[PDB]
DNA sequence: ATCGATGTATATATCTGACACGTGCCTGGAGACTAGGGAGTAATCCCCTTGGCGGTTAAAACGCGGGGGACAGCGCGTACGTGCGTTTAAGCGGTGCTAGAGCTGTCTACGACCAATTGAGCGGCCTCGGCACCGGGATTCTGAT
DNA sequence: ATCAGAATCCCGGTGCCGAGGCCGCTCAATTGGTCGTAGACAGCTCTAGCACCGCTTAAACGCACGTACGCGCTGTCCCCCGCGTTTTAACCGCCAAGGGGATTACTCCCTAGTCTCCAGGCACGTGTCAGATATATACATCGAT
């Protein structure tokens, strides 16, 4: 037979299309799962991951750090209106809060 | 030398808003968790990570509530948070 | 055990919340609020534990309780 | 007992966007939770859409619509672009 | 085109609890929506429980647990009583 | 064969056990559905419906009405703390609100 | 004869809290709905029940918001609701 | 068209909300808030319609949009 | 302005444990082929959405007088912030042991599936009684005196 | 307290239209039987949770004191309420048209299912370097004069 070529490599993705497919079939979502659905889902997940990781790496570099920590992730998410809206009701462990003091409290 | 009221408060705000460590003592919090759980089921064991998750959630919740309470205080032209402020915040939140 | 949540701790939490001045009755109010919250979460977590025929409340149980109460927590396995 | 996770893929993406930047175990756990959460949200929305339209198959259209409903603004726009590009490339082998 | 609804059963229950009381069409629509909503909530919680425990079957235990998790206080207590009584009677033919 | 006896009648219920079973099997909830699950669910649904209907009929009688309307349903739900909690994020069409005026506004 | 300020307001509160009809005019609301929908998709038709559902939801939402606004105003020792009150209510609600 | 939501209407809504006195800027604030709310709901409803390849927004579509935004409405088919 | 105290950032050196890489294996994903049924497409029909006309009346807009409520200023007294000395228990590190989570094997009860039957539930039609609209007297309640 | 006037409640009469009941039909639940498998139960392992002891030290706690802020009172003026008059457009009813939503029928291609294989990903192990800690220091900020 032919050498095994992963669906991820066929779609130019880093996320596992086969695994996503299995999770869809066994997740009690529908009776049948189309061939394009795992590819699409994997691509979306990858894009979101890339966005967050890029912003966190930028925050780390601004903090003179070379490793991303929950603090950096929290900073990246809370400083972006859209990401904050998406992750509004989510608590990041060991993330802390954004530095914010009301103007009326300043001396 | 004595710093005027407010200076040390603002310094504490800056420090704790810049830091991320948990602010409630672990052993007392654990005791509280176990005492509360005792009323639901006896001889209950607890994972360390379970207790840590509870602590993280509780602290986040309380910080958010204090933020809303502060907003209420400023709204009432005050700089001191009061129980009526907590009550207003919670009522509006739907709790 | 509720007294273990000392006044300095509540003050620290308020400081993280950006509070500059604190009334003396805030500590008792906060203790009550925390107790209610904890009771709800622990109740649900114990329900999950009992359903699993387990004797140990797990982090997953806690995570699920928070999730179903609209307080999704990241960092503890989901 | 083998426990599957998205660590490898998250790390790969990190190495693509920031070649000299690493990641802590805690942050990796956060990322894993994030991926799982988003997965669930999208899959559930697609399932609801399918049920509403009396369909038994979750397709790329259902995924796309779910993404449009959940992701706000340009997040949605770019995610849709990515998904469409990926599907096209896959369909063309 | 036949459109199923819970009208008949809601009416039976109404006639049991208030023999001389009727119901408007609007109120009937409200009741139908309510029943559907509660059904979805319970079934979804049972599904999650099953998945969490790596089980493929939704049983009376799952239903009971879902009821305890969703219904507050004495609502849950009495609902559990009712469900258990019904299951027992059914199992005894 | 034997005369058809409904599962509802076997369980002493008015709600349709068979229908509940079908909705569970075709609702993408699980692979298999136990025999007792529809019975339990139907009984719970019946209890909740009975409770609401009883309280609404009481409100109707208090209003010298013989027919239940959305107003009566709203009154019944909002005047019971537990039912209000259960149906917190729900809007009853044509239900209105509870008469409530803050004490500070009174003459 | 002139009723003192507040009497007719309280009478209106009682009347509208006792009644259940929709308070926004149907035709203007429908026009608003169609104008808003125009920006998303052209040549869109609308079911009568769709418009009615929208109206019901909007009215319920606004009533709830006015309730929270009133609470905020009273908290600030005022009896008049203001934009700052609406803003506070919405902010605390998470909107 | 937003002006069609007249001041008397907003006043009536406030009365149902238990409001006794109203500032003059409340009407414009309310109009803006309502516009935002409507935009969100209509957006989601239109998305559902387009997915169904329909040209008519249905009550069911509206209901679904409200449900997914946590504003469940009873009385219009779900 | 200004200087002094003072906390906080910043710069450098040691260590250490936690993360990034390698390895072996095994099980889940890929290649290949099959059936069958779900979804796509095309025609039809009918219902229900859109558009227009007219009247008429209820609701909205506008003007105006005034009163009461928002808001700014001021005084006071007390409660809370800051600092310091004392004490209390939290934390950390080691060690113990046993309960219970977790895995494997076996087998039996139980739920999917399938064909025939039939009776429960839905669509449609009809009618009468609950409710709504109108009008008029009774009672309540408000404000000026 | 009184009294007049305005608003609401209640009581009775008439009508009308929507809820309740009945009937035909049809398709979805029931019954009876079979078969695979999943989860219930037994038993064994070994992980980690609980209990304890001891030392240390950092955090909590109690108290003294001063002052900034909460709160009550007073005055002012402005702007929202409430009511009378004019205007306008919402609503109801009635009619016409057409477009698109729901339905049915035919086909075909797309996905589940099975088998065989093999490579990717995941426990285990390791080493080395980024960051934590400690110390000295520089620097900016707060406060009293």
Residue numbers in the entry:
A (entry chain G), F (entry chain C): 11 to 117
B (entry chain A), G (entry chain E): 39 to 133
C (entry chain B), H (entry chain F): 25 to 102
D (entry chain H), E (entry chain D): 32 to 124
Which of the paper's sentences describe this entry?
Histones H2A, H2B, H3 and H4 are the protein components of the nucleosome, an elemental structural unit of eukaryotic chromatin. The H2A–H2B and H3–H4 heterodimers are formed by interactions between the histone-fold domains, and the histone octamer is established with two each of the H2A–H2B and H3–H4 dimers. The nucleosome core is composed of the histone octamer and approximately 150 bp of DNA, which is left-handedly wrapped around it in a symmetrical manner. In the nucleosome, the N-terminal tails of histones project out from the DNA superhelical gyres.
Since all of the Cys residues are converted into Ala residues during the desulfurization process after peptide ligation, we used the H3.2 C110A mutant, in which the Cys110 residue of H3.2 was replaced by Ala. There is only one amino acid difference, at position 96 (H3.1 Cys96 and H3.2 Ser96), between human H3.1 and H3.2. Consistent with the structure of the all tail-less nucleosome, the overall structure of the nucleosome containing acetylated H3 was quite similar to that of the non-acetylated nucleosome.
